[PDB]
Amino acid sequence: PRRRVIGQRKILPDPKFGSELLAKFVNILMVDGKKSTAESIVYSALETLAQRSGKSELEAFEVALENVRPTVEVKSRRVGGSTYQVPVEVRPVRRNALAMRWIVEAARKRGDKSMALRLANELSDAAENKGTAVKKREDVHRMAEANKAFA
Amino acid sequence: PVIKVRENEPFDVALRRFKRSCEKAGVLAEVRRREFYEKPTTERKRAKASAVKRHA
Amino acid sequence: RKQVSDGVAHIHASFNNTIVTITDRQGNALGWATAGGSGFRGSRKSTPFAAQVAAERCADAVKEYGIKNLEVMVKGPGPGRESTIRALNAAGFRITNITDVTPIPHNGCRPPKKRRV
Amino acid sequence: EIDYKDIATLKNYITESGKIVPSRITGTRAKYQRQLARAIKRARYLSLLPYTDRH
RNA sequence: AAGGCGGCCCCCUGGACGAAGACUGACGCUCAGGUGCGAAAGCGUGGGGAGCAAACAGGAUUAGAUACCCUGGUAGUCCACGCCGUAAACGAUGUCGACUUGGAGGUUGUGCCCUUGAGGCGUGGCUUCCGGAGCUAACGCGUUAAGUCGACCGCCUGGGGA
User: Fold this and answer.
1) Contact A21, A61 (CB under 8 A)
2) How many whole angstroms separate alpha carbon D54 and alpha carbon C101?
3) What's the superkingdom here (chain B)?
4) Who's near C83: CB < 8 A, 6+ residues apart?
5) Which residues lie closer than 8 Å to C104 by C-beta, 6 or more apart?
6) Partner residues linked to C33 by β-bridges
7) Number of B:C CB contacts under 8 A?
8) Which residue among A39, A91, B20, C86 has its CA within the 20 to 30 Å range from the CA of A67?
């Protein structure tokens, strides 16, 4: 968008819980336009990640997101002929997007049997402040603290 | 550019006053001017160009 | 390590680095910290953030002396001229005076030649 | 009639750091500006005026 | 006069300008050859040497880097006395004189007026920018002419070789 100011498309709420967060999570987990295949995975993972804790589902999902949500990230910049990395503050919508994308890529990089099990384990790890999604968030925060001088 | 922080003034206004005084004194411009040698022909040409562009 | 309560913060704000030295009223140095010695090399060293954390670490090198009121003597054109002053005020210090003591020759020695970069 | 001994008058044409103010700021004639510069330099020599704010 | 000349003080010293007069009475202008002055670099002798910095050394960059950049660094830069006599030594515009609409400034004298004022109005010297006629191939110059003339001098005759 050189000049384009752009609005926002209408995302439908989740059929089971009525959450836009879960709808976007299903959208991020979906491949090849297979929304019904992704919804079953997300629902099985949320169910399995419900009995473990005890705070229903949506609450457990938000607890897992709270540990993967990055507050500050670095933006590459080419000014002084070299790699400038200015730490910029992340917006809440981009915060949720990054958290969900990291959780999905971390669950797909697992050795469990089904994607539902991988998701359940990744979300349980995130709620316990461990895993590879929390690892990536700490990596990003580390890279931001290193370049804090370039704010 | 000596700044004595007088009573009943916060630190921030004293710092801004110090900056204003050091810029009105022109110390930074001078120490940036004196760090490299400028030939007499170069400074004369620069002064002439500045006097010419100060005509608008 | 006795109590002074009257210091001077000598800030040497060069283009490539920033050196903060806290001395007593007479001029005997009590502690010092630099931007290059605080974990910054190359491009990060000549930044106001490096000067700020250097002023933070230098204020910790004098906590055993119990300084309450200290003066500020800024010298140099480099960055960190005001960043170090802010980092010193934020460290629980009563800034009494701020003074610019940058050396100005009255057309004295000949400076080096211009860089043809 | 500018006298290097008239420090009360000379202090009006020097900044807080002791430097001579330009004639564009005070709007004084070029001739009397030259006389003022000479008088200020002489008064600096006689230690009646400071060379700089340091010493 | 040009090259150039920049803290302050003293000693010696040249030129320019202005006011009102007095004086000499063409004593003037230009000038081949001639003579003198002539930035910087350079040379000789004797000093001095902080900073800067040809050469030089090392570190980088690079395909190479005998360079730009970085760390040092000798001559030199400084002083006295001689030599050198060259520069884009330029206004790329020889000197002297006369005449030709203007505007805004700068700098330095001088005169007039309840001096109202740091005022206004005249009158000289030098100086910056714009611009009219005119001139120019054009750019532009334009009362400080590259306009209209006069005196004398220097110089040019296709590009290289040179």
Assistant:
1) yes
2) 8
3) Bacteria
4) C48, C49, C51, C52, C55
5) B27, B30, B31, B34, D52
6) C20
7) 58
8) A39
Domain ranges of chain D: 1-55
Q: If you compute the radius of gyration of chain C from its CA atoms, what whole number of angstroms results? A: 15
Q: What are phi and psi of D48, to 5 degrees?
A: -85, -25
| CA pair distance D15, D25, nearest whole angstrom | 11
Q: Which residue has the tokens 């802010």?
A: C86
State the Cα–Cα distance between residues A23 and A12, nearest whole angstrom: 7
Tokens representing B51? 């006097």
Strands C29-34, C69-75: pairing kind = unpaired
CA→C1' distance for D16 and E108 (Å) = 33
The experimental method is cryo-EM
DSSP letters of chain C? -----EEEEEEEE-SS-EEEEEEESS--EEEEEESGGGT--TTTTSSHHHHHHHHHHHHHTTTTT---EEEEEEE-SSS-TTHHHHHHHHTT-EEEEEEE-----SS-SPPPBPP--
Probe site for chain B from C52, C98, C102, C110 (most B CB atoms < 10 A): C98
Determine which helix (DSSP H) or strand (DSSP E) holds D44, and give its type and residue range: helix D30-45
Q: Cβ of residue C117 near strand E, that is under 7 Å?
A: yes
- Mapped onto helix, strand or coil, the DSSP state of residue A73 is strand
Residue matched to tokens 């330009």 = D22
